[PDB]
Design a protein around this nucleic acid. Structure first.
Ligand SMILES: [Mg+2]
Ligand SMILES: [Zn+2]
Ligand SMILES: [Zn+2]
Lengths: 49, 299, 65, 168, 56, 49, 38, 49
RNA sequence: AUAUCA
């Protein structure tokens, strides 16, 4: 029972990276209904913005 | 295209994309009027639309190099769906389905690269090396978990991703002599500097030590001081020389442990290099603590 | 960021007056309204130039290269 | 109607296959190639067909055939319409549902509402408007750049010939 | 464009600066203001089409 | 200045009133398409491109 | 029933200025050297 | 000449907004066409109609 | 797909 073969790191790593990036808060590249726009690019027009 | 009026051999023509025309740059004759935006047209195949609202999104991109041309959708749940018909139409796809299932050996390569911390360009070379040699009569009956373990070092040896064969022996599995012969029948169809970053990091040495070890090891080879010792040993030895020269030292036991070499062997290379320690170091190396060239162990 | 040379509305040079204004406040303790007026900034267009300036350059200088 | 629409013609026996114009392909860079959702959906129909043909030809296991028929039924059906009530949608790897033919005609932005009943056009121009007390009621101030882009095709005639030659 | 008056035929007047200038009294039919509104311009290509615009 | 328009002192504009800096950033990758095909950073020659 | 370490599992993105972020215990002059805006 | 009216005059804080005419202005007269429909492409960006 | 513009 080789440990490195057992636990797939990419599962949680890219699983969070997907949500945060795209914004479809759910698993994963097969998302719907998933809630899009949960994560979005921070407005940097003005400081108040 | 070539202008029908002029005809000069290097046919100088411009694509005035903005006016949607293709012009002959010499006479000015328009050679074509229908002109399409390839960027936006490609946006219809590979988009950001995963929901399904885009009316522009109407196709999908495929990879004819890796999976040939296998167009195939998947029966899945939609908005208004009974969980019954999904099962039946999927249980019906089971009777229509061997080699169209050996593509799950790509899932073996993908799960091995991600367990070996390997880039996206390496997987796609390992998957192309495996697709073009898994049904060969030249490989015949080699250990099927050692021919995909050999096609990962084939994909790494083109994508410039330093991975020793003993690094892939740790992943799976590998029988050494078995995946060493298989790494040659497919090939018909590392260096000192490679290890230095990782070994040093585990060692916990500074950039200064890494650079010097890296310089020494190269010089050792250039000098041909170590006739045929394995590069891993050379590197571990060089790391020993440089580190001992600097403040934060590391012992043979500790270097060997990281390099996965034995102290005796590191000793072997080290003593061979030591005689030309002076030539080996970077010129602006600063020996510190109390370790100058004269004082280095010499062991 | 960095004092405007010349008031936008009338174009009276205001570029020289900055340090002098900042000095009449620390060194002379003087209130803003007197310092401006001392410096001969009489029209409100000219007054607003110095009075409402934010010398961001000084923060910008705090970064190394 | 005995000529144009006999009821026997509602059940599909032969399938008209649309040409590439209706389902364009794009050849990017030798390892990237894009096919239209219809070309995908067709290939499934075909695969499901080729399968069921082999089953009938061979030893027909009755219940393993009708199992493969109602798969074919699905692919053909889902190709004309993917938004079917009760049935599962045919999905395309990325999780997105296949753009059926129905769905291309349907909405605003469909072929009807959005390519025929209204469409974008050439000899069009758009910019920020501003007022003018010095323009006459019936005129419109046109920016030089906009005038220099928009064109009128004028026929060379004795009346304009000289003028036209000058603008040329 | 909920009006026939939301699309009207005007005389060109080539001018400098990047905005479409309109007479103020023609504001109301279009329902325009100058708070950042944009407007569309279409050019007829035939003597026939031009007549349609100018005459109707 | 009728119907939400305004008049600006062209004299003031010259003196720096309301000017602004503008920075756009263009990006590009040198992508690797499988075992052989690789994009390149270079000045294309019009005869072989 | 008789009887006969620390593993990596993933990379979690950090929110800036949080406890785990480097910039949390950062002074004004610190941030400037780090080419961040205070 | 003096104005018969007296003008309400004084400083007021005015903001410069992201909408500038030159990033808006657009004109087309024959240009790129879509592949499927063979109709003018979309948006200022793409030199659409 | 989000944000936004009148
Ligand atoms: Mg308005
Ligand atoms: Zn020509
Ligand atoms: Zn002034």
């Amino acid at each position: 029972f080789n440990m490195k073969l057992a636990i797939n790191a990419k599962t949680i790593t890219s699983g969070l990276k997907y949500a945060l990036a795209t914004g479809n808060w759910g698993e994963q590249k097969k998302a719907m209904s998933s809630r899009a726009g949960v994560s979005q690019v921070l407005n940097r027009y003005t400081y108040s913005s | 295209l070539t202008c029908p009026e002029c005809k000069v051999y290097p046919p100088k023509i411009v694509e005035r994309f903005s006016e949607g025309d293709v012009v002959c740059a010499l006479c000015g004759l328009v050679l074509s009027d229908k002109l399409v935006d390839t960027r936006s047209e490609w946006r219809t195949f590979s988009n950001d639309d995963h929901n399904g609202d885009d009316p522009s999104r109407v196709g999908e991109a495929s990879n004819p190099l890796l999976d040939g041309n296998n167009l195939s959708t998947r029966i899945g749940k939609g908005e208004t769906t009974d969980m019954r018909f999904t099962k039946e139409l999927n249980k019906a796809q089971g009777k229509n389905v061997k080699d169209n299932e050996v593509q799950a050996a790509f899932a073996k390569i993908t799960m091995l690269c991600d367990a070996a911390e390997l880039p996206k360009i390496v997987k796609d070379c390992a998957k192309e090396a495996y697709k073009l040699c898994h049904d060969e009569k030249t490989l015949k009956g080699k250990s099927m978990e050692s021919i995909m373990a050999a096609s990962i070092l084939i994909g790494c040896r083109r994508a410039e991703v330093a991975r020793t064969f003993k690094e892939i022996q740790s992943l799976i599995h590998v029988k050494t002599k078995e995946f060493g012969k298989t790494l040659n029948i497919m090939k018909n169809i590392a260096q000192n500097l490679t290890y230095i970053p990782r070994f040093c990091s585990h060692l916990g040495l500074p950039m200064q030590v890494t650079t010097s070890a890296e310089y020494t090891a190269k010089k050792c080879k250039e000098i041909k001081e170590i006739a045929g010792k394995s590069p891993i040993t050379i590197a571990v030895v060089s790391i020993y020389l440089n580190i001992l020269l600097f403040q934060i030292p590391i012992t043979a036991a500790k270097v060997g442990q990281t390099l996965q070499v034995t102290e005796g062997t590191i000793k072997s290379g080290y003593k061979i290099l030591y005689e030309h320690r002076d030539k080996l170091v970077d010129p602006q190396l600063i020996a510190n603590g109390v370790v100058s060239l004269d004082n280095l162990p010499g062991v | 960021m960095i004092v405007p040379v010349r008031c936008f509305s009338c174009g009276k040079v205001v570029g020289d007056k900055w340090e002098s204004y900042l000095n009449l406040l620390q060194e002379d303790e003087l209130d803003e309204g007197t310092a401006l007026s001392r410096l001969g900034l009489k029209r409100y267009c000219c007054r607003r130039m110095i009075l409402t300036h934010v010398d961001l350059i000084e923060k910008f200088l705090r970064y190394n290269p | 109607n005995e000529v144009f629409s006999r009821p026997e013609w509602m059940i599909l026996t032969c399938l008209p296959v649309p040409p590439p114009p209706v389902r364009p392909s794009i050849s990017f860079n030798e390892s990237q190639r894009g096919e239209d959702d219809l070309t995908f959906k067709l290939a499934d129909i075909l695969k499901a067909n080729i399968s069921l043909e082999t089953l009938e030809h061979n030893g027909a296991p009755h219940h393993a055939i009708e199992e493969a028929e109602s798969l074919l039924q699905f692919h053909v059906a889902t190709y004309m319409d993917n938004d079917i009530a009760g049935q599962p949608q045919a999905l395309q790897k990325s999780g997105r549902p296949v753009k059926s033919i129905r769905a291309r005609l349907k909405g605003k932005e469909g072929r009807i509402r959005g390519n025929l009943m209204g469409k974008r056009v050439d000899f069009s121009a758009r910019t920020v408007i501003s007022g003018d007390p010095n323009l006459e009621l019936d005129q419109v101030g046109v920016p030089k750049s906009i005038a220099k882009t928009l064109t009128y095709p004028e026929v060379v005639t004795p009346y304009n010939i000289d003028r036209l030659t000058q603008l040329v | 464009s909920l009006h026939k008056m939301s699309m009207m035929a005007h005389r060109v007047k080539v001018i400098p600066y990047s905005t479409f200038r309109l007479n103020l009294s023609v504001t109301s039919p279009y329902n325009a203001d100058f708070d950042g509104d944009e407007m569309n311009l279409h050019v007829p290509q035939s003597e026939e089409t031009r007549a349609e615009l100018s005459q109707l | 200045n009728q119907e939400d328009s305004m008049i600006m002192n062209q004299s003031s504009i010259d003196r720096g009133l309301f000017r602004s800096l503008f920075f756009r950033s263009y990006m590009d990758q040198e992508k690797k398409y499988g075992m052989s095909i690789t994009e390149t950073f270079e000045k294309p020659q019009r005869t072989n491109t | 029933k008789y009887e006969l370490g620390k593993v990596f599992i993933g990379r979690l993105p950090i929110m800036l200025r949080s406890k785990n972020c480097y910039l949390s215990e950062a002074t004004e002059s610190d941030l400037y050297k780090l080419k961040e805006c205070p | 000449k003096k104005l018969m009216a007296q003008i309400f005059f004084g400083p007021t804080y005015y903001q410069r907004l992201r909408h500038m005419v030159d990033d808006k202005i657009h004109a087309r007269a024959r240009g790129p066409m879509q592949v499927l429909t063979r109709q003018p492409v979309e948006g200022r960006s793409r030199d659409g109609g």
